[PDB]
RNA sequence: CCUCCUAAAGAGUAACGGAGGAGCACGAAGGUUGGCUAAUCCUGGUCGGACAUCAGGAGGUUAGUGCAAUGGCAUAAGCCAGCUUGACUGCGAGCGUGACGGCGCGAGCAGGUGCGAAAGCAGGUCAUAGUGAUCCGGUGGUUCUGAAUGGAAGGGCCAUC
RNA sequence: CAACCCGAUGCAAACUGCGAAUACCGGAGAAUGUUAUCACGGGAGACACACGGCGGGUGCUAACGUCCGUC
RNA sequence: GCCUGGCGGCCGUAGCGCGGUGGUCCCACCUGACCCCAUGCCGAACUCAGAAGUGAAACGCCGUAGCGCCGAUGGUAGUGUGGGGUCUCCCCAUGCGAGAGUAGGGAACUGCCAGGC
């Protein structure tokens, strides 16, 4: 909860005045990181799936949820069932600890990262940016992996607006781009 | 069709038995499930089922 | 040419409209292929496999309309 | 609404109880409290009741809704619904997974004498 | 030359009319043709009339057609026995009844519109009349 | 044989009338207990593009239903999982529907099951198609009968091909 | 070039967020009706109908046409 | 009587939207989570032990008629029996009499038990 405390400390108040909030029980709280990584493919290999899973199982201290299809009406293929991903949301402590893991060592462990999207947000006020490629960060070994990786990440905050979404993260150490 | 008829026999010495169908083309495992044996008037384990 | 054929009788309907003698279990309504057309309620219920409004204990028939979203509902109070 | 969900879960048996028209023993739960009441078949008038929201019980209680605390609540409605000449009733966990406090109290009213 | 692009069914029962349509008064132009009689337009008539209608107004103004065929109407071949399956959809009729609003004009003098719908009802079974916009 | 219209708001109705389907499928796609709920669009997201997976918002049975159509379904019958064998045996108040043969619905009772803490639910599948009477025989069971008597062949009865 | 959506206008046997007359089913009541009603049993004949009215399929809302419902 | 919770009646003039609003009573979030129990990943949900905080969300109220919804009187359509004209349609007598639309209504009402003022 390292960064978690920071929220209650530096954050919250920063927003309480900047956003001029009336109740501490309003300040846009951080509502679990999601993580997905729609590996897909499978068919060709099928093993790369559990690979993309084991990879996530490392990126995160929890257990990957190898998701399935749904519509089946997919040109690519897919038939109702059939593996195709591994969301794996974040759990409170592990969540913030993760929010710490990255932004402090992940985003830092770049490839050429010269700023971060300031519009990866939504309408409600939630951000979700793709890493483009797993930076090999604290995962099961480094030079010991497989054909690339990459994945997606979403924050999702109680922010009533994308604007308020900016305040959050901004109060933290979100590198962003400006 | 492809659904052959099966004869679930009683594990008890009684010659009593049940009848139904099965798709041996995909379910080679001999079916058993336990039913009621009128003769002994007591439930038991019925067998025999392609 | 294709056009032809058709099912047989298949009555299914109200055979015990409103209050009736309602014996131990007449029918009150055999309008199969339903649940909402006629719902099992009151002293009467059953609603056999073929969605046939059973009708228990002897008495009169009511034919009501209760619960959220219309819902006919049949039952048999005492007489 | 997490509440709107719990309702439909019980809307089932709650209808089954009506079907049989048996005096059900409702039991609503909440973070800080544990309620209980024996409503009549008609589901309009309640015969008895006993909830942690009543001083008499709260006093003798450490913390409202503490299992062993959400037990006397049942033992109470029990006798309370026995001196009334009431007995042999149906339990309605009202959507609450029969396992925690609701699990208890039920054994309380059960042990107390209630038939169910 | 005006029929439905699709129909869940190939043939419709004979049926019949019952007078008094719905489109009583104009609600698009300010003139138009009225029913006055019960009948049915072979859809080919509605077009035959439209052409005469258009080619009279020169171009000025706009026109409307509140009537539509949608009705199959079959026919049985010549030398062919009876009762051997329903005939084949030959054309498409447009059931109309008294009060029915056939067409409608607006951007053209009533003197023209009038002397235009006449050159229309000439190519029509049902006896039509003339109508105005009417504030109500 | 099943479904809709024809069919005039009970049942039922004809045509070489207008339109489709069945001759099966499932040891789970049955039972129960526990839990879940869509289609579609918008927006924002590595490879993800018309169309995979993810996040939110709108949406509300327009999804789904093993297979036609109609009716039905959120207490879901629709979906997931645990454990199971009630797709049990003998009966059956009372009804519906047939000229008849017959077909259908069925609470409750007796014996034994299963699932559940429990109330309770289960006598196959959401229902309505998935079917062949009789005879002549085949198989298993039965101390019913068995042409002088004891057996036996054969016959009956029950299950079944 | 145009669907979706929005407002204005229609159409439907296999459309329905509405909805009659009315028929039908059951209950109570008076009057009337040589029991008209139901059950069982002896004897039947009859299962080519026709026209007209009304509601329809089919035909051309043709036929002293044809196939139903009903009088 | 004011407010709140549980359970029902009746199910749109009871709903939706929008604005205001209530709190450490009740409720809600909320805290903590080895554990009971739970996640085809997550203490999100269920589940347990409970502060600190806030009514923010939800919920409950109140106001508001923009979207629902209820909805006549009158006229219109249809129709039973009797009669009449008639190209397949319609008229008259007389009973029954819609649907839509208009007037207008309308921001639910109500019982039982419990807890706060
Ligand atoms: Mg009928
Ligand atoms: Mg996208
Ligand atoms: Mg089926
Ligand atoms: Mg009729
Ligand atoms: Mg004959
Ligand atoms: Mg004849
Ligand atoms: Mg005849
Ligand atoms: Mg003739």
XYZ file of N, CA and C (backbone and C1' of nucleotides) in Angstrom, chain A residues 41-43 46 68-74 76-84, chain F residues 52:
67
model
N -4.393 -15.741 -31.211
C -3.699 -16.762 -31.988
C -4.099 -18.165 -31.546
N -3.304 -18.748 -30.653
C -3.559 -20.091 -30.142
C -3.454 -21.123 -31.260
N -4.568 -21.351 -31.950
C -4.631 -22.306 -33.053
C -3.248 -22.747 -33.521
N -1.107 -22.704 -29.705
C -1.953 -23.104 -28.584
C -1.190 -23.095 -27.264
N -12.080 -17.103 -22.784
C -12.529 -17.814 -23.976
C -13.208 -16.843 -24.935
N -13.735 -17.384 -26.027
C -14.432 -16.589 -27.029
C -15.820 -16.254 -26.497
N -16.720 -15.863 -27.391
C -18.075 -15.502 -26.995
C -19.056 -15.439 -28.161
N -18.703 -14.677 -29.189
C -19.563 -14.522 -30.356
C -19.442 -15.683 -31.339
N -18.241 -16.244 -31.449
C -17.981 -17.359 -32.355
C -17.995 -16.893 -33.807
N -18.842 -15.912 -34.100
C -18.952 -15.363 -35.444
C -17.701 -14.543 -35.737
N -16.553 -15.211 -35.761
C -15.291 -14.531 -36.015
C -14.635 -14.998 -37.307
N -11.563 -14.575 -38.240
C -10.307 -15.190 -37.833
C -10.598 -16.670 -37.621
N -11.634 -16.933 -36.830
C -12.078 -18.285 -36.509
C -12.963 -18.211 -35.267
N -12.509 -18.836 -34.185
C -13.237 -18.844 -32.921
C -14.608 -19.507 -33.015
N -14.897 -20.375 -32.051
C -16.170 -21.083 -31.996
C -16.675 -21.162 -30.559
N -17.411 -20.130 -30.157
C -17.977 -20.023 -28.817
C -16.908 -20.165 -27.738
N -16.433 -21.387 -27.511
C -15.399 -21.591 -26.513
C -14.078 -21.120 -27.091
N -13.067 -21.977 -27.009
C -11.743 -21.692 -27.555
C -10.991 -20.587 -26.806
N -9.824 -20.918 -26.226
C -9.000 -19.957 -25.482
C -8.614 -18.773 -26.365
N -8.371 -17.612 -25.760
C -8.004 -16.446 -26.553
C -7.402 -15.282 -25.762
P -14.822 -7.438 -32.254
O -13.703 -8.570 -32.168
C -13.191 -8.983 -30.906
C -13.321 -10.479 -30.760
C -12.769 -11.050 -29.455
O -13.583 -12.149 -29.071
C -11.586 -11.969 -31.295
